[PDB]
C-alpha cells in the first residue's frame, strides 16, 4: 500500500537535500578548472575497491531461489566491474602517483577518509540480517547517493575527456547511463520495489535504512569537502 | 562451561599449529629472508585490524563492566599496525609502486580470506553481549600468538644478523599479547552463550585457516620475492 509509497518519497527527499551538499556545488562550479574540482578523485581509493568487494560478497548469493535476491544478483554483477574504470581515470587524470607501499596504506587509511574507507562496512553489517526485499531498499538508497555524485563529477570528467581527447569510464556520462539501467531483459529494482507492498515491521525498517544510507553518505561527502579545501592549490595533471 | 570453551581454544589452537604454513615459517633449513616472502600479505590484515580495535570492539559510549575492560584492551592491540609498518620497511618490503599497484595488491583476489577476516570478525561481533566479544578476542589473540610465535624465528633471526629493532615479527609483539583469560575463566555462561561461545571459536579458526591458506598460496607464487633486510 502507502508503506512503500513513502520509502521512495524518503529516498527523493533524502536525494534532495543530497543534491545541495556543497561539495556538489563545488564541484559543478564552471569558474574553477575541472583538474581543480577533481582534485578529491584519489579519495575514492578508499571506497571503490570495498564497494566492489560489497556487491561480490555481501549483496550476492548465487544459491537464493528467491525472486527478489536473483535480481539483486543480475545488477550487482555488473556494478562490481566499475572498480576499474576507478583505476583507469585514477590514471587519466595523473594521480596513479609513484609512491612507497606503506605511503599508500597510510593514505587509505588515513583518519580524514574513516567515513569513506566504512561505508561499505557499514552497508555490510546494515545488510547482514535483511531479506532480498529490504536488501533492495539499501542498494535503492545507495544507487540514488551515487548517482548524485557521479551526475556532479561528470561535469568536470566531460571536459577533460573532450579537451585531452582521452576515454573516461569513471567520472563520466556512461558510469551514470550503465548505472541507471535501461536495458531490454531485467526489471530495474526501482520497478521492483514500486510494485511490493510493505508490513509495517518493513516500513519502519525501510525508513531506517533510508536515513543511514544517506546520514553515511553525508559523512562520506564531507570528507570529501574537507580534503578539498587542505587541496586547492593542487590539481589533476591530465595528459592528452 | 567456560571451561568447555577454553579446551575448545586449546583444542583448535593445537589443530591450527599443525598447519603447513607454520611448518615453512620454522624450518630454519630455508633462508629467514625466503620464509618471511608472505610478509607483504599482512598489508591486507594489519590496519583492518587497527579499525576492527578502534570502531568494532571499542564502545567509548558505554558503561557496562566488561565492555570497559575490552575498550583497554583494544588501546594496546590498535598500536601493533605501526610495528607492522617499521619492519615492512626493514624488511625491505616497503617498495616504490604506483598507487593502483598498491590497490591491487591489498584488493588481490588471492587475500580474499585475508582481507575480509576483519570484516567478519565484526560482522560476527555487532550484536554481542560484552563477555561474549571477549570471548571472540581471546580466540583471535590465541591465532595471533600461533602465527607471531612462528614469525618471530626467522623475524629474531633476521634483527640479530642485521643489528635492527624488529617490532612486529619480533619477541617483543609475542611477549605484549600475553586480565581477559582471568576473567572468562571466572564467568558463569547460560547455555545458550555457551552454544553462542562455540560457534564464535570456530568461525574464528576457520577464518584464521583460510588467511593462512592465502600466505601459503602466495609464497609459493612468489618464491623469488624473498625479504632484502640490509645491516645497520
Ligand atoms: N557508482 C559507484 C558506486 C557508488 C554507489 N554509492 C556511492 C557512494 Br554513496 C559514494 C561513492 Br564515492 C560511490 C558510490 C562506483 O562504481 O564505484
Ligand atoms: N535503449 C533502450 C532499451 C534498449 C537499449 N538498447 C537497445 C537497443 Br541496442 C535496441 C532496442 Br530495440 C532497445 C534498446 C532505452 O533506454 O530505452
Ligand atoms: N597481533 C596481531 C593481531 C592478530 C590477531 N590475530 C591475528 C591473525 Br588470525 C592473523 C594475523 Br596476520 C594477525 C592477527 C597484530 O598486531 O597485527
Ligand atoms: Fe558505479
Ligand atoms: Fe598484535
Ligand atoms: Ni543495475
Ligand atoms: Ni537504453
Ligand atoms: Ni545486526
Ligand atoms: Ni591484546
Ligand atoms: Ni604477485
Redesign the pocket.
Given at each position: 500500500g502507502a508503506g512503500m509509497k513513502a520509502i521512495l518519497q524518503l529516498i527523493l527527499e533524502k536525494r534532495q537535500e543530497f543534491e545541495k551538499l556543497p561539495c556538489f556545488e563545488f564541484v559543478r562550479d564552471e569558474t574553477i578548472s575541472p583538474e581543480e574540482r577533481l582534485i578529491l578523485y584519489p579519495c575514492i581509493a578508499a571506497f571503490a575497491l570495498n564497494?566492489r568487494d560489497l556487491n561480490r560478497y555481501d549483496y550476492r548469493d548465487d544459491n537464493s531461489s528467491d525472486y527478489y535476491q536473483k535480481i539483486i544478483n543480475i545488477h550487482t554483477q555488473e556494478?562490481a566491474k566499475?572498480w576499474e574504470?576507478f583505476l583507469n581515470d585514477l590514471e587519466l587524470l595523473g594521480f596513479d602517483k609513484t609512491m612507497r607501499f606503506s605511503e599508500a596504506l597510510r593514505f587509505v587509511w588515513s583518519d580524514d577518509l574513516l567515513h569513506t574507507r566504512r561505508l561499505c562496512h557499514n552497508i555490510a553489517v546494515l545488510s547482514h540480517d535483511l531479506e532480498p526485499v529490504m536488501k533492495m531498499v539499501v542498494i535503492e538508497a545507495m544507487?540514488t547517493a551515487?548517482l548524485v555524485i557521479?551526475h556532479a563529477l561528470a561535469k568536470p570528467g566531460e571536459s577533460i575527456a573532450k579537451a585531452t581527447r582521452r576515454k573516461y569510464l569513471?567520472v563520466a556520462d556512461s558510469?551514470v547511463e550503465?548505472?541507471t539501467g535501461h536495458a531490454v531483459g531485467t526489471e530495474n529494482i526501482i520497478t521492483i520495489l514500486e510494485q511490493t507492498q510493505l508490513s509495517s515491521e518493513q516500513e519502519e525498517k525501510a525508513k531506517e535504512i533510508v536515513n543511514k544510507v544517506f546520514q553515511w553518505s553525508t559523512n562520506l561527502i564531507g570528507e570529501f569537502e574537507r580534503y578539498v579545501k587542505a587541496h586547492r592549490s593542487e590539481k589533476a595533471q591530465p595528459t592528452a
Amino acid at each position: 500500500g502507502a508503506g512503500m509509497k513513502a520509502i521512495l518519497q524518503l529516498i527523493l527527499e533524502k536525494r534532495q537535500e543530497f543534491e545541495k551538499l556543497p561539495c556538489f556545488e563545488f564541484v559543478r562550479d564552471e569558474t574553477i578548472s575541472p583538474e581543480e574540482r577533481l582534485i578529491l578523485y584519489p579519495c575514492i581509493a578508499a571506497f571503490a575497491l570495498n564497494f566492489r568487494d560489497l556487491n561480490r560478497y555481501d549483496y550476492r548469493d548465487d544459491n537464493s531461489s528467491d525472486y527478489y535476491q536473483k535480481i539483486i544478483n543480475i545488477h550487482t554483477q555488473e556494478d562490481a566491474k566499475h572498480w576499474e574504470w576507478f583505476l583507469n581515470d585514477l590514471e587519466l587524470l595523473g594521480f596513479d602517483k609513484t609512491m612507497r607501499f606503506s605511503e599508500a596504506l597510510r593514505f587509505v587509511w588515513s583518519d580524514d577518509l574513516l567515513h569513506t574507507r566504512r561505508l561499505c562496512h557499514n552497508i555490510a553489517v546494515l545488510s547482514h540480517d535483511l531479506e532480498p526485499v529490504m536488501k533492495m531498499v539499501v542498494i535503492e538508497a545507495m544507487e540514488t547517493a551515487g548517482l548524485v555524485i557521479f551526475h556532479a563529477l561528470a561535469k568536470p570528467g566531460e571536459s577533460i575527456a573532450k579537451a585531452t581527447r582521452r576515454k573516461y569510464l569513471y567520472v563520466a556520462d556512461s558510469h551514470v547511463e550503465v548505472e541507471t539501467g535501461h536495458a531490454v531483459g531485467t526489471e530495474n529494482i526501482i520497478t521492483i520495489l514500486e510494485q511490493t507492498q510493505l508490513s509495517s515491521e518493513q516500513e519502519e525498517k525501510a525508513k531506517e535504512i533510508v536515513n543511514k544510507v544517506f546520514q553515511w553518505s553525508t559523512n562520506l561527502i564531507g570528507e570529501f569537502e574537507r580534503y578539498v579545501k587542505a587541496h586547492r592549490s593542487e590539481k589533476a595533471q591530465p595528459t592528452a
